[PDB]
């Protein structure tokens, strides 16, 4: 079988869409192509492929008649086509679907839209006559939910834009569908609009949802006769017992570190969407800190929201090492430690204010395919604090689909941040930014990107540490690999999401695969490159680390796990590589 009888176009322009019931589909595709090219009389006589071709016809205009219950200007605009355009069956179908959608917008749930082109062969033109019957307005009598055997009905009815006892809007139901997808509590959402048997003008709306399991709270204790007892445990949840409250409580206790954190929040404190929540934490590592914060926030439009809150943290340090950056800070604070003398202490009570702004137009909770998200967070100190500073972090991500089936997608992921002191004071060094690891740039050891400490005499560990740590040998300034973090950072990654031809159906909605290229850098400020001219200049922002690789994301029964491998291409002295990485994500 081949293509026979084409003179307007050659077969090389047509066979490219053929697989040579597949043939019936290819023949319908070719017929649609010709109809969309003005060939009003194009058809197929028989399959052997004997083609009959016509000429090209141009549209003369569109007439519309029928039971148009107002909105005539909108219909005219939808059907307004400039004269001279070629006849196109697809355009006609599109116009009919746009009319149906427009009518649905105002409650005409079941319009009847049909059209018939008049083909003028003496003069090659097509005049279209459209017959529209708007029908009656529909009202929603009951809204019901099925499948929600764990979550409370109160949750599903708040993520809705269609109220009972009012006219139907198709877009007002679809918005509900999207908001439920944005909640992140369901595997799938679908809809139905079944007519009420007792009246031609009333319809019910039914949503089908399937909840995924969440939380997976863990615990465990390491133990041995050499290692002793090491306890770690915690619980995390997004939809605790189905009430919509988020909970996070974790902690650990061992012979070198002890800490705990609790964070609880209510996305809907009030009926109109005002949210409240907060957290408490304690972490004593053998330096200690502890504190609390409370945040309130609310929406300002369908896509944007604001947050703000207050809190307090206590920070107490001791036995600090003689680092140049740390001592610069301490001197800026008025401290005068003795050179290379480990005997020291410092503690402050810092009262702060934090705030932020978000935007979220993503289509899915965990595997978005379109849209973008922006998260801008600021933090400032207030009078009465010992450390006067501000910070800003911007985190954005945009998904752009390529494929109609959304298998080919390009993701832009970027993060930037900065911060500084007030009044001529320095930023505390324990608030510095770090990068590297699966959360930022893959292929590098965690918190290894950035400038490193230079060490300068008394210590209780003198004999055991490196020669520049031991105070019998630590006679001068030494370079080290001990990352201290910085006051500025930037990270970016370009990730391509592709099909997964190597997975079975059970993974069809659980496994995503992508290719990526990562870049980023961390740098400082207030770096006196003259005094420390014998070491690298940390103020140079051009030493950007770069790597690329492949990753797979799997929404396993135990939560979102990420497996990846990447290799570096751009590395600077002092960096440490890590080529194979795996982490539990519970983010993105």
């Amino acid at each position: 079988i081949n293509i026979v009888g084409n003179h307007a176009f050659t077969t090389d322009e047509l066979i490219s869409h053929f697989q040579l019931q597949k043939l019936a589909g290819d023949l319908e595709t070719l017929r649609s192509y010709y109809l969309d090219r003005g060939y009003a009389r194009f058809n197929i006589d028989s399959t052997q492929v004997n083609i009959t071709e016509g000429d090209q016809y141009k549209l003369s205009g569109v007439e519309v008649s029928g039971n148009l219950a107002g909105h005539s200007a909108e219909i005219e605009q939808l059907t307004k086509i400039e004269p001279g355009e070629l006849y196109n069956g697809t355009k006609v179908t599109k116009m009919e679907d746009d009319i149906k959608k427009l009518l649905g917008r105002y409650g005409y749930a079941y319009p009847r839209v049909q059209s018939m082109p008049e083909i003028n062969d003496a003069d090659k033109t097509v005049k279209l006559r459209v017959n529209v019957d708007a029908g009656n307005r529909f009202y929603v009598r009951k809204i019901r939910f099925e499948g929600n055997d764990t979550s409370k009905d109160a949750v599903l009815r708040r993520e809705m834009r269609q109220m009972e006892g009012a006219w139907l809007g198709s877009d007002l139901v679809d918005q509900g569908k999207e908001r439920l997808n944005r909640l992140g509590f369901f595997e799938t959402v679908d809809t139905d609009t079944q007519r009420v048997p007792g009246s031609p003008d009333q319809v019910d709306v039914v949503y089908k949802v399937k909840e995924r399991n969440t939380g997976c709270f863990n615990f465990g204790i390491g133990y041995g006769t050499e290692s002793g007892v090491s306890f770690q445990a915690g619980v995390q949840q997004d939809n605790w017992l189905g009430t919509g409250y988020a909970v996070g409580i974790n902690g650990t206790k061992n012979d070198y570190q002890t800490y705990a954190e609790l964070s609880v929040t209510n996305p809907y404190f009030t009926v109109d969407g005002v949210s409240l929540g907060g957290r408490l934490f304690y972490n004593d590592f053998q330096n200690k800190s502890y504190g609390t914060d409370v945040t309130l926030g609310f929406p300002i439009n369908e896509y944007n929201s604001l947050r703000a809150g207050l809190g307090y943290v206590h920070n107490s340090l001791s036995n600090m090492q003689p680092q140049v950056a740390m001592w610069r800070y301490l001197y800026s604070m008025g401290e005068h430690p003795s050179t290379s003398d480990q005997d020291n202490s410092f503690k402050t009570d810092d009262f702060t204010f934090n705030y932020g702004w978000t935007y979220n137009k993503l289509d899915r909770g965990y595997f978005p395919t379109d849209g973008s998200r922006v998260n801008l967070t600021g933090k400032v100190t207030i009078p009465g604090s010992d450390n006067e500073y501000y910070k800003v972090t911007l985190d954005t991500a945009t998904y752009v689909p390529i494929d109609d089936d959304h298998k080919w997608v390009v993701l832009g992921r970027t993060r930037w941040g900065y911060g500084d002191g007030l009044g001529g004071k320095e930023m505390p060094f324990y608030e510095n930014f770090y990068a590297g690891g699966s959360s930022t740039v893959r292929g590098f050891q965690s918190n290894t990107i950035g400038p490193k400490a230079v060490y300068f005499q008394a210590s209780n560990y003198d004999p055991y540490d490196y020669e520049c740590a031991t105070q019998d040998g630590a006679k001068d300034l030494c370079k080290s690999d001990d990352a201290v973090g910085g006051n500025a950072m930037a990270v970016a990654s370009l990730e391509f999401i592709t099909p997964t031809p190597f997975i079975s159906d059970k993974y069809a909605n659980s496994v995503r695969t992508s290719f990526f290229w990562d870049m980023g850098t961390v740098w400082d400020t207030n770096w006196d490159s003259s005094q420390y001219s014998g070491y690298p200049d940390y103020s140079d922002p051009s030493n950007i680390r770069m790597s690329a690789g492949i990753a797979l994301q799997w929404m396993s029964p135990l939560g979102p796990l990420v497996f990846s491998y990447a290799q570096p291409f751009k590395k600077y002295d002092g960096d440490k590589a890590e080529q194979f990485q795996f982490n539990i994500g519970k983010t993105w």
Binding site: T214, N218, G220, G222, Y223, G559
Partner: peptide, 24 residues
């Protein structure tokens, strides 16, 4: 040394490092 009871119900012990996970 290790066994599961149901999907997302996992316990291990393996001197030893006892750990348990359970999903809702």
């Amino acid at each position: 040394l290790n066994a599961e009871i149901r999907d997302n119900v996992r316990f291990g012990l393996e001197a030893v490092n006892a750990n348990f996970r359970y999903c809702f």
